[PDB]
Every structure is written in C-alpha cells, then in structure tokens.
Amino acid sequence: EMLARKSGRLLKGGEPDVDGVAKQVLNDFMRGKIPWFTPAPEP
Amino acid sequence: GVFAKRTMTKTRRRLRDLDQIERDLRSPRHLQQYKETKAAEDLPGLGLYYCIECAKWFESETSLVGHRKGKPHKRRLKQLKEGAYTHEEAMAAIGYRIDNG
RNA sequence: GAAGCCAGAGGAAACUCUGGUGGAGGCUCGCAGCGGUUCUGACGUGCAAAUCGAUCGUCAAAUCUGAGCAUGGGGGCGAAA
RNA sequence: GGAGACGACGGCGGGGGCCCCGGGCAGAGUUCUCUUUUCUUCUUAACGGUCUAUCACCCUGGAAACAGUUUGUCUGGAGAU
RNA sequence: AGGGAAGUCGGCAAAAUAGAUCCGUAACUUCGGGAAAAGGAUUGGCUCUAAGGGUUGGGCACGUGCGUGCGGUUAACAACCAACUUAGAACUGGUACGGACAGGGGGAAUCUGACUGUCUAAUUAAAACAUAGCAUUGCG
RNA sequence: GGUAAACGGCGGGAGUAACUAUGACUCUCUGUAGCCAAAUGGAUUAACGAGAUUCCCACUGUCCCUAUCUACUAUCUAGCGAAACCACAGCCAAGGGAACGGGCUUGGCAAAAUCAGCGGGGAAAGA
RNA sequence: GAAGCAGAAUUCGGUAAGCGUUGGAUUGUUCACCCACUAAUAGGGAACGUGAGCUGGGUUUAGACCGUCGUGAGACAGGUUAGUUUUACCCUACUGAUGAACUCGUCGCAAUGGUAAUUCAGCUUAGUACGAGAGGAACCGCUGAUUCAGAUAAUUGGUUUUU
RNA sequence: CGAAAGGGUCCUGUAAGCAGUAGAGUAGCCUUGUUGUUACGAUCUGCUGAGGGUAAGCCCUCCUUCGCCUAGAUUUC
C-alpha cells in the first residue's frame, strides 16, 4: 500500500493498486533488481 | 460533467439518498453504520476526509475545503435546508395517519 | 519553453538560488494539403481496369507542388522494393 | 560605382482595404404588446501640386554619481544624452 | 433491465475518456525528458464588487504670441476619452451546466529499430532502406 | 622474404638430446554485499513507433439472449433495360467389376401456369 | 436377472436410441488434460476411402531478418513478422404464397404425411420398514422446479418519428 | 358509411399574458430614508393538475352537425 501510494499506483478513487505493485515487486525480484542470494552451507 | 452519463441511472451506479444523509447528520450511529459498510483501506485519503452532506470521500483536507466552496456542496446544503422527502411527508400529502391507540 | 538579457537574495570572487524576459528545436496536439494504418467495413459484370466511408500517419521540414530543362532499353533512375 | 539583383523563420511598429460601434438625412421592414427600433445608400481612380512621415546623416558640446534605450540589451571620447 | 469478456484464436467492434481553471504527478533517464504521467476538485444563469489605461493642462520679473533671469517637484491634482481580460461575492434553476458541436481511455511490462525520414502506384509500411556517428582502403 | 593477420587454425605451462623452419620425447594442470580501477563498473541503453506480445483498472449488446426504432434498398407500379453462362436437360432409392452417373435396369412415384425468399447441390473463382 | 444385496449407496449383466448428454480455465502447443454444475455430462457416421458457407492452425508466391549449410547465386534442422478471389437474377431441392378447369358459396368427412414431451426436488408415507449402532428407504396421495414445445401482453421491464 | 365536433380514457407537467410591500443587488429623484420613492433585475408566487396532444391498429354518441347511397364495368353449368 505504501509503495502504491508513493509510486502513484492508484485505481479509480485513489485506491492503491496492490496487485500491480505486487507484480512489479515480483518482476524486480526475478530480474535482478532486488539483492538476494542463498548462502552456501558451512562445512 | 458526469462520468459515464449513459449508465448513471443503473442500480450499481447508485448514490446515497438525501433522507439517509439527514439521518447521518442527525445521528452518528447511522453514519457509523454506513462507514462500517465500507473498507477504510479502499477509501480516498484512507477515509479520514469525508463530507457528510455530499456523502463523499476526498483525498485531502485541501480537497474537502476546496469542494465546500463549490456549487454542488451548496446545492446539497440548500436541499438539506429545504428538507428531504420522507414517508411521513408522503402520508401527510394525502392526509394519512398512523393510529397506534 | 533552449541560448541571450533584467531584477532581487547569497558568495572574497567563479558561481548558487528565486521571479521575470525571450522564442530555439529535422520538438509536440491539431485544421487545410500530402500520405495510406485498421475495419469478418461499402463496392466486387463497381461511380472507379484500385473508387467510397469511418479511423489513422504527418503537418515549418529529409514538407507539398507548377512550368521549363536533363538522363533512353546492351540503357536510365533508384533513402535498394 | 549604383540600380536591375534576390534565402527561410520569429515577434514589434506605420499605412490601405475589410470587420465592428455611435450620431444624422432619405427609404424599406416589424408593430397583440415592446422596440426614439432592425436593415439599406452615404463613394472618390490613374496622374500631379503642396505639407508631413521610422532608419540614417550633419552642427554645438564633451558624458562615472555612467547615460540613452527596445516586447526582445544594444548603443556611446571612433563623441553618447 | 441484471450480470460485466462468462464471447472470441485474439476485448475485433462498440462503449468509456476528452475543452478550460486549480491541486497534484512515480520508476527510469543520454538530466534534455518521462508528463496532458497517475490520481483528484470545479464549469449554467443573473446582480454586483475590485484590479489592470490614454490625451491635455503649472507661477513671477522684464523685452514683446515668443526670448531670457529666476523660483517648485503633493499635477500624490483636475478635465475629457477609452477597450478587453482577470479575480472575488451574493442570489437563483437543475435529472443535464465544454448541456448541440468539438474533443487523450489510462496503466505494468517484454521483444524490437536509436530518433525525424523513405519504398514494393494496383495484396506485404516493417526488426527492410536511409540517416548522423564510427572504422578501413586507394589517390599529390 | 614481411603482413589487412582479413579468412582461418588454435586446451595450457615447463624443459631438453634435436639445435632454423615442422621440432620430437618426457613432466604435470583443477562481502547479506568485497577489492581495485577516473561519481561509475553499464547492453537489464533513455526518448520516439499506424512494429510484434502478456496482463491490470475503467468501460461496455462480445455475449448469456435476444428485443425494438429510423433512413435507403429489397417489394409493387410507370418508363427504361443489360451481362455472365448455356451439348441436351434437370425428383429420388438400389444395382450398373475398371470405387463415376443425370440418360441404362428394377422400384418409389408422378397433374397446368406461377410469386417472394434461400443457399443442399447442378452451375458459378480473368480456377 | 444376479451378488452379504439388512436399509442406504452400489457392482455385474439383459431389453431398450423414446428422451437428454452442459459450462468454463489452460496455445510456453501433437491443445490434450484439469475444476465445477449435473440425472448424466456415452461413443460414433453422414468430410478426413482428395475436394467453393464463415473463420483460427498443417501452410508454404512476391517484402524482411535471426540460426544451419554453401565461395556464391541461394538452399534448409529450423525460429519470427506482414501479406487480393469478389456468385446466384438460372434449373432443381427446401420454406412460405397464389392459383385455371368442376356455377358460386356455406357446413363438414379424413386417405395420407408429420407428431412431443423430459428430468429432478420438496411434503406425506416416516425417523417408519430395516438396523448392534451410525444411519435409513419405497408404493398410493400432494406441490413446485430443469430442459423442450406451443401461445400471449393484464402486469413489470426494454424499445420512441406519437418527433 | 365518412368527415368534423363533444364526452371519456391516457401522455406530458402548470400555457401566453397580467399582477405582486417576493427577489441578491445596482443606479436615479427628493421627504435624505423612516417597505423613502422610482427604474432594471436570473428567478419565485397567483390566476393554472393549467396549456398542448389523443388513433393514425383507444372507447362512446338513432338522441351534436355536415355530406354520401338502391351505382359503373366484366364474367358465369
């Protein structure tokens, strides 16, 4: 909701576009725009 | 200008009635009932900015103070000053009364 | 709303900010013109051996266009189909 | 030596013509009611005379406490006001 | 009517949006843009109010309508003339107020060609061609 | 003899007895956000596009499930008036060896002259 | 009809085509499998033993990139994009509409052709039969609904050139 | 029977005009404000469920009017 309100992802009546922001966040997660990795197990 | 004027008389495009607005102004319990029939996360301005006379939500206090100077809000004020049509006035128009003993 | 210019506010100065002015761009919406994207479009012995309607691209320029002139088939011309 | 003799675009100023407003004479229309109303004519060529019209140039004089000045910041001891 | 893509290979077609004033406007970016992003508030009529202009015109002492010598910057005043914008307020009709006409649907992404431009007149307008930039070769 | 080293070939690194091109003969090879680089470490490139694709909100006669209205036709009349195509003709069923019947055989049947439509054959695609 | 088939729900089989057999999602793909409603969501033929209704794929003229091959013109193991066939007024068939001859008309008959209904639920039976328990029917009677069919416009919607 | 008309039944929504101590306000003349007065002025109120339409596929009317009529042509055991 905060991401939608900050980025203007609003439907009719100013309601946040939660599903569209979720799709954007997921796309950024897979396409290397958010840093994440699985650490290797310690021997 | 009215958005989608072709289907503004449909039941799914219906707005709040003037007698309901009068009861909302007179009783906070009725307004509370109407507000619990809505979700606060979907309302403009998180539901914090509401005009009872227009029965309509706004994104900000600036927008609410803005519409108060407009003619639709003054039209609503004049209609409320005249008084909404009710079943009591409908009975009084034909001379009908209720006998409860 | 680009350079150029004016004023005010700071800065030792170079410069910084604010409000104007100005009217640049193979910029943009769009009329005419030029073109020709789409439609189970019209038409299909048609008005027409390529026309009509709506919609569309472009619209100060690598824009549109007249006349005169030049290039002629083993050729010419070709932002090359 | 000059003229003939020369690009595109932008805003600014002058002039003609058109558009618009008011008064007047004449005519026409409207008129249940209103409308001292609505409409129409009211023009002046080429060719000449005469008096004037941005730029520019000339004379006096020598400008900082710089000045004049355009919508647009250009001009001035190479002489500005 | 009700539902709102359940239709269809596919939202094809239609509908919805649209002028103007004000609030506000994200990522990304070659810092120029994106952008009219997105999302909102309003618009009729009538009666008023306010602001934004132009032209002309200064007292004495002499010579006689002009020439000097002075004196003053409340003309911050009078007279006349003039047109279109902008803002504010009250009142009032309403189912409509850019009332016809005119007039962006918007957004998240992917591929692709840098862009503006050009071609298969009469089935293909495009990742095709051209373009600026870059690189190489030959020639005194 | 030298290369535009363009095409092309090219798994490395050491040695030597060859001694130069071709060598040949052994050996063995597996930071939950840093460091270093002249703020950045990029092509995951912005804008622009009648280019191709997926999805969301709004919107609706695309359907569900169709209904109704208008104009011009189609219709009927007056006038005027073609063309395509055409061996001959047009009801079917079963059989008709060459997997084809419209005419033959055997049956069903079968009654003048017509009008508006329709798209199964038969005709009809500069086929 | 048969089965440890108590009841309920079934299973195997027989006669039977009278009557039904549905939405929908998924095109990184042999589009075949999923989810639901339901009484049930059975399978085929009349094309595919070549073949003009419309419309997406096999699918393929001319334009264009990308991959493989080729010195090349070009060809393909391939992948992507854009792309011209446009009747009917003829005979027959079918659906409707007239009709000569038998004077005109009214009331009729009926050969022949067609033919139509379908499924579920609820009340009662009955918490009964049956059953250790959990559970749990049916015939007669009654009322609605699903699909289909034929009509109709009192009412409610829709449609407005009643301009 | 036809054309009008009248009545009914429906549809719309209160006609034109006149008036008003209704009307936000503005401007004049004077009693300089005491509806001071007069003028204009969206609108409002009253006359006014009034005006307008009504079969073209609405109803009634021997009894409200006007008009028309026993044809013409063709054919027939």
PDB file of N, CA and C (backbone and C1' of nucleotides) in Angstrom, chain F residues 13-21 23-27:
ATOM      1  P     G F  13      51.180 -21.433 -22.861  1.00  0.00           P
ATOM      2  O5'   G F  13      51.991 -21.833 -21.552  1.00  0.00           O
ATOM      3  C5'   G F  13      51.644 -21.288 -20.287  1.00  0.00           C
ATOM      4  C4'   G F  13      52.258 -22.079 -19.163  1.00  0.00           C
ATOM      5  C3'   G F  13      53.737 -22.390 -19.305  1.00  0.00           C
ATOM      6  O3'   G F  13      54.563 -21.298 -18.948  1.00  0.00           O
ATOM      7  C1'   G F  13      52.580 -24.338 -18.631  1.00  0.00           C
ATOM      8  P     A F  14      56.061 -21.208 -19.520  1.00  0.00           P
ATOM      9  O5'   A F  14      56.899 -22.122 -18.522  1.00  0.00           O
ATOM     10  C5'   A F  14      58.119 -22.716 -18.933  1.00  0.00           C
ATOM     11  C4'   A F  14      58.419 -23.961 -18.137  1.00  0.00           C
ATOM     12  C3'   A F  14      59.637 -24.753 -18.584  1.00  0.00           C
ATOM     13  O3'   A F  14      60.844 -24.219 -18.070  1.00  0.00           O
ATOM     14  C1'   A F  14      57.813 -26.222 -18.236  1.00  0.00           C
ATOM     15  P     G F  15      61.764 -23.269 -18.980  1.00  0.00           P
ATOM     16  O5'   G F  15      63.140 -24.062 -19.084  1.00  0.00           O
ATOM     17  C5'   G F  15      63.373 -24.980 -20.140  1.00  0.00           C
ATOM     18  C4'   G F  15      63.385 -26.405 -19.649  1.00  0.00           C
ATOM     19  C3'   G F  15      64.188 -27.386 -20.491  1.00  0.00           C
ATOM     20  O3'   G F  15      65.565 -27.393 -20.159  1.00  0.00           O
ATOM     21  C1'   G F  15      62.048 -28.296 -20.034  1.00  0.00           C
ATOM     22  P     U F  16      66.586 -26.368 -20.857  1.00  0.00           P
ATOM     23  O5'   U F  16      67.874 -27.255 -21.145  1.00  0.00           O
ATOM     24  C5'   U F  16      68.054 -27.881 -22.405  1.00  0.00           C
ATOM     25  C4'   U F  16      67.638 -29.330 -22.377  1.00  0.00           C
ATOM     26  C3'   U F  16      67.973 -30.125 -23.630  1.00  0.00           C
ATOM     27  O3'   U F  16      69.305 -30.610 -23.627  1.00  0.00           O
ATOM     28  C1'   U F  16      65.718 -30.519 -23.032  1.00  0.00           C
ATOM     29  P     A F  17      70.463 -29.829 -24.420  1.00  0.00           P
ATOM     30  O5'   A F  17      71.240 -30.987 -25.190  1.00  0.00           O
ATOM     31  C5'   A F  17      71.080 -32.347 -24.810  1.00  0.00           C
ATOM     32  C4'   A F  17      70.901 -33.235 -26.016  1.00  0.00           C
ATOM     33  C3'   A F  17      70.069 -32.648 -27.146  1.00  0.00           C
ATOM     34  O3'   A F  17      70.826 -31.800 -27.992  1.00  0.00           O
ATOM     35  C1'   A F  17      69.313 -34.835 -26.672  1.00  0.00           C
ATOM     36  P     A F  18      70.215 -30.405 -28.506  1.00  0.00           P
ATOM     37  O5'   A F  18      70.008 -30.628 -30.070  1.00  0.00           O
ATOM     38  C5'   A F  18      70.609 -31.729 -30.737  1.00  0.00           C
ATOM     39  C4'   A F  18      69.616 -32.440 -31.620  1.00  0.00           C
ATOM     40  C3'   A F  18      69.320 -31.776 -32.957  1.00  0.00           C
ATOM     41  O3'   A F  18      70.280 -32.053 -33.963  1.00  0.00           O
ATOM     42  C1'   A F  18      67.290 -32.239 -31.893  1.00  0.00           C
ATOM     43  P     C F  19      70.652 -30.922 -35.046  1.00  0.00           P
ATOM     44  O5'   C F  19      69.305 -30.081 -35.201  1.00  0.00           O
ATOM     45  C5'   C F  19      69.317 -28.656 -35.218  1.00  0.00           C
ATOM     46  C4'   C F  19      68.522 -28.081 -34.070  1.00  0.00           C
ATOM     47  C3'   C F  19      68.299 -26.571 -34.119  1.00  0.00           C
ATOM     48  O3'   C F  19      67.058 -26.259 -33.486  1.00  0.00           O
ATOM     49  C1'   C F  19      69.511 -27.118 -32.174  1.00  0.00           C
ATOM     50  P     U F  20      65.932 -25.410 -34.258  1.00  0.00           P
ATOM     51  O5'   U F  20      66.633 -24.012 -34.555  1.00  0.00           O
ATOM     52  C5'   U F  20      65.871 -22.814 -34.609  1.00  0.00           C
ATOM     53  C4'   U F  20      65.621 -22.380 -36.030  1.00  0.00           C
ATOM     54  C3'   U F  20      64.551 -23.152 -36.785  1.00  0.00           C
ATOM     55  O3'   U F  20      63.232 -22.730 -36.480  1.00  0.00           O
ATOM     56  C1'   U F  20      66.479 -22.886 -38.152  1.00  0.00           C
ATOM     57  P     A F  21      62.329 -23.583 -35.459  1.00  0.00           P
ATOM     58  O5'   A F  21      60.831 -23.234 -35.875  1.00  0.00           O
ATOM     59  C5'   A F  21      60.140 -24.010 -36.844  1.00  0.00           C
ATOM     60  C4'   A F  21      60.243 -23.395 -38.216  1.00  0.00           C
ATOM     61  C3'   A F  21      59.321 -23.964 -39.285  1.00  0.00           C
ATOM     62  O3'   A F  21      57.999 -23.453 -39.199  1.00  0.00           O
ATOM     63  C1'   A F  21      61.509 -23.805 -40.149  1.00  0.00           C
ATOM     64  P     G F  23      54.891 -27.966 -34.796  1.00  0.00           P
ATOM     65  O5'   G F  23      56.405 -27.842 -34.312  1.00  0.00           O
ATOM     66  C5'   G F  23      57.024 -28.896 -33.589  1.00  0.00           C
ATOM     67  C4'   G F  23      58.256 -29.409 -34.293  1.00  0.00           C
ATOM     68  C3'   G F  23      58.520 -30.899 -34.148  1.00  0.00           C
ATOM     69  O3'   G F  23      57.776 -31.666 -35.080  1.00  0.00           O
ATOM     70  C1'   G F  23      60.540 -29.652 -33.860  1.00  0.00           C
ATOM     71  P     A F  24      56.680 -32.725 -34.573  1.00  0.00           P
ATOM     72  O5'   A F  24      57.523 -34.045 -34.292  1.00  0.00           O
ATOM     73  C5'   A F  24      57.118 -34.967 -33.292  1.00  0.00           C
ATOM     74  C4'   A F  24      58.305 -35.642 -32.656  1.00  0.00           C
ATOM     75  C3'   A F  24      58.166 -35.961 -31.176  1.00  0.00           C
ATOM     76  O3'   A F  24      57.276 -37.047 -30.871  1.00  0.00           O
ATOM     77  C1'   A F  24      60.190 -34.835 -31.500  1.00  0.00           C
ATOM     78  P     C F  25      57.722 -38.559 -30.519  1.00  0.00           P
ATOM     79  O5'   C F  25      58.385 -38.461 -29.073  1.00  0.00           O
ATOM     80  C5'   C F  25      59.410 -39.363 -28.682  1.00  0.00           C
ATOM     81  C4'   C F  25      59.970 -39.015 -27.326  1.00  0.00           C
ATOM     82  C3'   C F  25      58.959 -38.898 -26.198  1.00  0.00           C
ATOM     83  O3'   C F  25      58.589 -40.159 -25.667  1.00  0.00           O
ATOM     84  C1'   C F  25      60.478 -37.076 -26.113  1.00  0.00           C
ATOM     85  P     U F  26      57.417 -40.266 -24.575  1.00  0.00           P
ATOM     86  O5'   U F  26      58.166 -40.063 -23.185  1.00  0.00           O
ATOM     87  C5'   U F  26      57.450 -39.642 -22.035  1.00  0.00           C
ATOM     88  C4'   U F  26      58.317 -38.853 -21.087  1.00  0.00           C
ATOM     89  C3'   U F  26      57.562 -38.083 -20.017  1.00  0.00           C
ATOM     90  O3'   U F  26      57.206 -38.899 -18.917  1.00  0.00           O
ATOM     91  C1'   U F  26      59.190 -36.674 -21.010  1.00  0.00           C
ATOM     92  P     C F  27      55.694 -38.915 -18.380  1.00  0.00           P
ATOM     93  O5'   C F  27      55.659 -37.731 -17.319  1.00  0.00           O
ATOM     94  C5'   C F  27      56.722 -37.557 -16.395  1.00  0.00           C
ATOM     95  C4'   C F  27      56.790 -36.136 -15.898  1.00  0.00           C
ATOM     96  C3'   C F  27      55.471 -35.525 -15.461  1.00  0.00           C
ATOM     97  O3'   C F  27      55.111 -35.907 -14.144  1.00  0.00           O
ATOM     98  C1'   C F  27      56.706 -33.973 -16.776  1.00  0.00           C
TER      99        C F  27
END
